[PDB]
């Protein structure tokens, strides 16, 4: 199956400079032609740029907004695609995209993203405090920056009946909450963890909503 | 540069119905050779990367149901979705391919179900968060239609407008309802202050507000 992996997003601080790589599989990269397409935060989509297959000599387009301080290319032999980007603006934040789009066709696959933060403000942890009174229970996490954040209820066990709530901006810090409604029996009797990570500073703590 | 714009910007049908969103273009888009018409259409669930759903105006992409219709020539071009499920729901964007990219601005599809009053909890601060010289008061608005909801903070019975932050939830692809969090953040020291909290709702699911209560 085809498979798109982009890594690299993360904070970084204006003017500075972020270069993302993107992993594909399930299909022959050396023919066709890959693009960029990011998504800014509360905005649509935007095409960023393409890079065309051997056969038409490595062609490179780019927007207007990004053209001259991007760089995509491209490695055939490992079937990797790169987005350098430099003198990065504020304007630059939000989602990018890999995504596989053959000439005179229409873009097929695109992966699942890589978020990128440009600002100047700093790194910091997020400090997640259990929510204790079908019972709900919730965990709040607050403080933290820059986005995003992973909640989980037991590991992944609990899927139903949870709901993450969007991040909220509030004083340069973000605050989110995630709650879980179970059936009254398994909690206390049966243990409820909220699990949090932040990859912005290599965290992940499980904290057991008791009562 | 040509800019497509799409219309309405949002749309709220019912489980079976038909429905049809716009997307018109600043340029002509019919290549006059090879007579296609270059504008794609796309849509991305909550959460989940773009999908593709057609191409040259009316071609659906591999795997796509025909439940899904793409139409038009020129600069006007209309997307027709029938039999609209519950999963249906995500914003949906048409692109052109003439020149380069461009995308629309998307249209949102929301799906009209059944009234559903909301679930209250309140939540008092932690002892950690406490100990750490602070107090947020979680609520918890979920599972509610439409998406429509007052919630007051009350605090002994004066109403708190200050320090709180709200967030609303997509509608939910399972049962298309809205959920809420409301979160009010006093000092350790003003939760001191005073002793019965409230989160009050009012929906119009309910004559009067519902109130959910805990007293320090």
């Known amino acids: 199956q085809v498979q798109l992996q982009e890594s690299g997003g993360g904070l970084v601080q204006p003017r500075g400079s972020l270069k993302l790589s993107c992993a594909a599989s399930?299909?022959?990269?050396?023919?066709?032609?890959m693009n960029w397409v990011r998504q800014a935060p509360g905005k649509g989509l935007e095409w960023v740029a393409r890079?065309?297959?051997?056969?038409?000599?490595?062609?490179?387009y780019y927007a207007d907004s990004v053209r001259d301080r991007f760089t995509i290319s491209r490695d055939d032999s490992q079937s990797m695609l790169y987005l350098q980007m430099n003198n990065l603006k504020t304007e630059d934040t939000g989602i990018y995209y890999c995504?596989?789009?053959?000439?005179?066709?229409?873009?097929?696959?695109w992966g699942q993203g890589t978020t990128l933060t440009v600002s100047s403000a700093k790194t910091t942890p997020p400090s997640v405090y259990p929510l204790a009174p079908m019972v709900t229970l919730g965990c709040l996490v607050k403080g933290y920056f820059p986005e995003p954040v992973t909640v989980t209820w037991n590991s992944g066990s609990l899927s139903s009946g949870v709901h993450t709530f969007p991040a909220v901006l509030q004083s340069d810090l973000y605050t989110l909450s995630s709650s879980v409604t179970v059936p009254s029996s398994p909690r206390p009797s049966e243990t409820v963890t909220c699990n949090v990570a932040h990859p912005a500073s290599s965290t992940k703590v499980d904290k057991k909503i008791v009562n | 540069d040509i800019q497509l714009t799409q219309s309405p910007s949002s749309l709220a049908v019912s489980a079976g119905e038909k429905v049809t969103m716009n997307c018109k273009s600043s340029?002509?888009?019919?290549?006059?050779?090879?007579?296609?018409?270059?504008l794609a259409w796309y849509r991305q669930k909550p959460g989940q990367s773009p999908k593709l759903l057609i191409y040259?105006?009316?071609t659906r992409g591999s795997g796509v149901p025909d439940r899904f219709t793409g139409s038009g020539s020129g600069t006007d071009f209309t997307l027709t979705i029938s039999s609209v499920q519950a999963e249906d729901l995500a914003v949906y964007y048409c692109?052109?391919?003439?020149?380069?990219?461009?995308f629309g601005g998307g249209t949102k599809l929301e799906i009209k179900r059944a009234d559903a009053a909301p679930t209250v909890s309140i939540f008092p601060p932690s002892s950690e968060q406490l100990t750490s010289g602070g107090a947020s008061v979680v609520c918890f608005l979920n599972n509610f239609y439409p998406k429509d909801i007052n919630v007051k903070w009350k605090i002994d019975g004066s109403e708190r407008q200050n320090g709180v932050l709200n967030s609303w939830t997509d509608q939910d692809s399972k049962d298309s309802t809205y959920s809420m969090s409301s979160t009010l953040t006093l000092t350790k020291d003003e939760y001191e202050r005073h002793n019965s909290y409230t989160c009050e709702a009012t929906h119009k699911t309910s004559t009067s507000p519902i109130v959910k209560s805990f007293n320090r």
């Open positions: 340029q002509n888009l019919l290549h006059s050779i090879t007579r296609k018409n270059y």
């Open positions: 399930g299909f022959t990269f050396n023919t066709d032609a």
């Open positions: 890079i065309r297959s051997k056969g038409f000599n490595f062609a490179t």
């Open positions: 995504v596989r789009g053959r000439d005179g066709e229409a873009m097929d696959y």
């Open positions: 692109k052109q391919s003439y020149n380069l990219y461009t």
């Open positions: 040259w105006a009316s």
